[PDB]
Antibody, heavy 229, light 212 residues
Framework: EVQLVESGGVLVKPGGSLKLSCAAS????????MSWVRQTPEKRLEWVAT????????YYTDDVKGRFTVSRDNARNNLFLQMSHLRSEDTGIYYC???????????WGRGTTLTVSSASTKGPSVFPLAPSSKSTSGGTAALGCLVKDYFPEPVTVSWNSGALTSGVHTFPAVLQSSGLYSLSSVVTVPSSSLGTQTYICNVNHKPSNTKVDKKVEPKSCGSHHHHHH | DIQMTQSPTSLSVSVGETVTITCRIS??????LAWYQQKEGKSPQLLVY???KLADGVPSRFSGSGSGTQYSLKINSLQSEDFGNYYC?????????FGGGTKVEIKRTVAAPSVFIFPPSDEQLKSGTASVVCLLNNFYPREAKVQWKVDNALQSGNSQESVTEQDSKDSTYSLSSTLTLSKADYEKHKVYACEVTHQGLSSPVTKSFNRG
């Protein structure tokens, strides 16, 4: 199957540089023009640059002329976007695409997020949302991870290294008044098998290069040292 | 310059129904048009190109028509997986540009949320902060009110919430709300409660725990 997988996607100081990469597979790479299309702040799709199939010719949208260079390695099925003089308006999600040049874009990659900002990157802390009698009903239990205090977006969350996708809700993040992001990822599973299944949320904040894995299990409530207030 | 109007900007329509989305252009572009679906987070998908040509792997309930300055995308019987944003794109002159979008919502019957509360992890409390999470799962329509109550006192200013996009299988929404307190403020109250209102609920639903 066709596959376009971007890399890069970090914080950059205003005025700085960055190389985005795209690995292509599942078709004859050198047969196709290749493009970057970005999803701007507003949520509008905007073509950026296109390199013809041979890497000979390159085309750019006015706003990035003289600042960005698109190139390709036909020996390895790689597409690059070299960016210098980054400015705040360049912040967005950058999709590698297969370009039926002049015309339309018939395959797109997952996207990579470029945040232009003078803030520091910060990785998240990850906390369990343990299933308990407060998250159970109808034989079904909800559990999750709370992913707190990271910048910039995004964090990606998976469960059990990708082997669990059903019943998962990963919520849009909220911007805390610290300027740091927060989000939760939950899943609802059978109560029955909370003693046999192990559930691990996998948190990847690529902009900070931090991965965190966190087992989420039922927590036994009682304690020999305890009081009532 | 070359610009487009997409219309409607927003639609809400039931499964099995017929939806037309229209793209009107400022010049005649001689059928040099394409259509795309994008769901939140996820990457765009080509639907239709050259105004009338169905892209491969696209269900045949999609089709496109029109010419000159008037183009249309028609979904024959809408399916729950056809939620998201739809965009037109011209390729008449340079640059190729994109329309503003039509957001498509799947209308369905009412579903009450299931409500779940989570006390702070013991690991977080050791760091000095107490996040309390209230979860509203799989409801419709989107509108849902969360009220935080601490020792029966109406809270305000210490929570934030957010809604998912629409579910591609059941067309419901889910919502997560977090109440944030210092550890010290957390230890001075007993009852932490989440009070939920929705069109699908006659009386409100309260999930609560005692710190213990």
């Amino acid at each position: 199957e066709v596959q376009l997988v971007e890399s890069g996607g970090v914080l950059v100081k205003p005025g700085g540089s960055l190389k985005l990469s795209c690995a292509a597979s599942g078709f004859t790479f050198s047969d196709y023009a290749m493009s970057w299309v970005r999803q701007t702040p507003e949520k509008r799709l905007e073509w950026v640059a296109t390199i013809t199939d041979g890497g000979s010719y390159a085309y750019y949208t006015d706003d990035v002329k003289g600042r960005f260079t698109v190139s390709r390695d036909n020996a390895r099925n790689n597409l690059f976007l070299q960016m210098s003089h980054l400015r705040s308006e360049d912040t967005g999600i950058y999709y590698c695409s297969r370009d039926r040049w002049p015309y339309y874009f018939d395959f797109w990659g997952r996207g990579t997020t470029l945040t232009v900002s003078s803030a520091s990157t910060k990785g998240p802390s990850v906390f369990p949302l343990a299933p308990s009698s407060k998250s159970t009903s109808g034989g079904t239990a909800a559990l999750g991870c709370l992913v707190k205090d990271y910048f910039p977006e995004p964090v990606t969350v998976s469960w059990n290294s990708g082997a669990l996708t059903s019943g998962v809700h990963t919520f849009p993040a909220v911007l805390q008044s610290s300027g740091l992001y927060s989000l939760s990822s939950v899943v609802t599973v059978p109560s029955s098998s909370l003693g046999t299944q192990t559930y691990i949320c996998n948190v990847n904040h690529k902009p900070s290069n931090t991965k965190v894995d966190k087992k989420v299990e039922p927590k036994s409530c009682g304690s020999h040292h305890h009081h009532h207030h | 310059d070359i610009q487009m109007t997409q219309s409607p900007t927003s639609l809400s329509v039931s499964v099995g129904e017929t939806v037309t989305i229209t793209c009107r252009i400022s010049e005649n572009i001689y059928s040099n048009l394409a259509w795309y679906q994008q769901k939140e987070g996820k990457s765009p998908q080509l639907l239709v190109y050259a105004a009338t040509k169905l892209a491969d792997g696209v269900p045949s309930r999609f089709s496109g028509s029109g010419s000159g300055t008037q183009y249309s995308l028609k979904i024959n019987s809408l399916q729950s997986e056809d939620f998201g944003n739809y965009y037109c794109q011209h390729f008449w002159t340079t640059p190729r540009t994109f329309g503003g979008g039509t957001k498509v919502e799947i209308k369905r019957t009412v579903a009450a949320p299931s409500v779940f509360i989570f006390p702070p992890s013991d690991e977080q409390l050791k760091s000095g902060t107490a996040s309390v999470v209230c979860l509203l799962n799989n409801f419709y329509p989107r509108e849902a009110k969360v009220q935080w109550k601490v020792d029966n006192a109406l809270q305000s200013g210490n929570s934030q919430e957010s809604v998912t996009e629409q579910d591609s299988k059941d067309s419901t929404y889910s919502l997560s709300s977090t109440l944030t307190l210092s550890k010290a403020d957390y230890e001075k109250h007993k009852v932490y409660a989440c009070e939920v209102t929705h069109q699908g609920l006659s009386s409100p639903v309260t999930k609560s725990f005692n710190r213990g």
